[PDB]
Write an enzyme that holds these catalytic residues in place. Structure first.
Site, PDB file in Angstrom:
ATOM      1  CG  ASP A   1       0.769   4.227   4.177  1.00  0.00           C
ATOM      2  OD1 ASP A   1      -0.438   3.945   4.244  1.00  0.00           O
ATOM      3  OD2 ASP A   1       1.668   3.358   4.194  1.00  0.00           O
TER       4      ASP A   1
ATOM      5  CG  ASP B   1      -0.147  -0.109   2.513  1.00  0.00           C
ATOM      6  OD1 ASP B   1       0.290   0.946   3.025  1.00  0.00           O
ATOM      7  OD2 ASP B   1       0.049  -1.252   3.000  1.00  0.00           O
TER       8      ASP B   1
ATOM      9  CG  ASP C   1      -4.172   3.720   3.779  1.00  0.00           C
ATOM     10  OD1 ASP C   1      -5.280   3.430   3.287  1.00  0.00           O
ATOM     11  OD2 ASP C   1      -3.454   2.916   4.404  1.00  0.00           O
TER      12      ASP C   1
HETATM   13 MG   LIG Z   1       1.829   1.320   4.313  1.00  0.00          MG
HETATM   14 MN   LIG Z   2      -1.414   2.233   4.478  1.00  0.00          MN
END
Ligand SMILES: [Mg+2]
Ligand SMILES: [Mn+2]
Ligand SMILES: [Cl-]
Ligand code: NA
Length: 325
Positions: free
Chosen positions: A195, A193, A249
């Site tokens: 961020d 992911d 995110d």
């Molecule tokens: Mg992360």
């Molecule tokens: Mn994340």
DNA sequence: CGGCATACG
DNA sequence: CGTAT
DNA sequence: GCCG
């Protein structure tokens, strides 16, 4: 070797990789069984090995190391003597471990949901698909995109996503900034992911910003899924001749809080738990991603940098690349 | 023995 | 309940 | 599971 991970540098790559990976299997397994205390000790013991300056080759080198008692020392002893730890291999092979791992990897599925599905007899992703009335929309997204989300994100992907996020942030609020956080800020070359932390140099201008950003990303056709201060999204990322789903995110903070949010979102997760534990238990201060509170004076510490925060807590400064606890 | 990080969606 | 570090 |  100090007892808290925030008290020592932990680099991304180190000299005890096999030993720490084994302990982290036992930590993960403890979590699947709801034993957060045992998860923590195995995580901490793994992290201590990451912080060592050379390979552990004999059992006596564990003497004096924090978080190494009968159980973790026995794990290491067996790995040193035989190359494998029977307990660890048993966990690895177990139907329970493999299924809980598979299920909790789904975005939208935690230990408690995984555990109930396990107990109902479900074992596979297709088991879940054959009964979609049982899934939340979040879980439905997590399951449709599971294959792409299982493929590591590369740093090249990250730079492309950052430019895209900056464009939408720039329309939503001129002057707002986008900072890469999470594992990539610690120097990871891959991740599952991306961020980002968003702020604006004029305190208060960031109020209401995230909806405006999400609406703009959605209008550009970039958002495959999203649900405020925090947004957990699935983005459409360009690939040669096609694209792939990527978890991203987005977090917004006021610039007064930015050092705390930067520290809090840069991790590692164990580093942050240990830093908050240290703050509260050793210094009597309460730390979160918003601020640092003295509960005696009833005052918040103003910080202009992560350096400020480490100094507040009486800890030597650790750059992100040394926070890989 | 108590404690184990601390939030937001 | 999920998510995040 | 381990610390204090
Ligand atoms: Mg992360
Ligand atoms: Mn994340
Ligand atoms: Cl927080
Ligand atoms: Na999950």
């Amino acid at each position: 070797m100090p007892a808290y991970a925030c008290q020592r540098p932990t680099p991304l790559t180190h000299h005890n990789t096999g030993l720490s990976e084994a302990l982290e299997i036992l930590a993960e397994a403890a979590g699947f069984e709801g034993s957060e205390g045992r998860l923590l000790t195995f995580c901490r013991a793994a992290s201590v090995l990451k912080a060592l300056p050379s390979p552990v080759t004999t059992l006596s080198q564990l003497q004096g190391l924090p978080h190494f008692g009968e159980h973790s020392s026995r794990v290491v002893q067996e790995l040193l003597e035989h190359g494998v730890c029977e307990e660890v291999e048993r966990v690895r092979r177990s139907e329970r471990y493999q299924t809980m791992k598979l299920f909790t990897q789904i975005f939208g599925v935690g230990v408690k949901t995984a555990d109930r599905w396990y107990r109902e007899g479900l074992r596979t992703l297709d088991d879940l698909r054959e009964q979609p009335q049982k899934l939340t929309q979040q879980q439905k997204a997590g399951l449709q995109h599971h294959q792409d989300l299982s493929t590591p994100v590369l740093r090249s992907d990250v730079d492309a996503l950052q430019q895209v996020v900056e464009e939408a942030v720039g329309q939503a609020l001129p002057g707002a900034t986008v900072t890469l956080t999470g594992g990539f800020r610690r120097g990871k070359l891959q991740g599952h992911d991306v961020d980002f932390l968003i702020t604006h140099p004029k305190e208060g201008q960031e109020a209401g910003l995230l909806p405006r950003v999400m609406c703009r990303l959605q209008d550009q056709g970039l958002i495959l899924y999203h649900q405020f201060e925090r947004s957990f999204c699935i983005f459409r990322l360009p690939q040669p001749g096609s694209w792939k789903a990527v978890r991203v995110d987005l977090v917004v903070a006021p610039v007064s809080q930015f050092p705390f949010a930067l520290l809090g979102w840069t991790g590692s997760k164990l580093f942050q738990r240990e830093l908050r534990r240290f703050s509260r238990k050793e210094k009597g201060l309460w730390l979160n991603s918003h601020g640092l509170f003295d509960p005696e004076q009833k005052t918040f510490f103003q910080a202009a940098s992560e350096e400020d925060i480490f100094r507040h807590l009486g800890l030597e400064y650790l750059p992100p690349e040394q926070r890989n606890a």
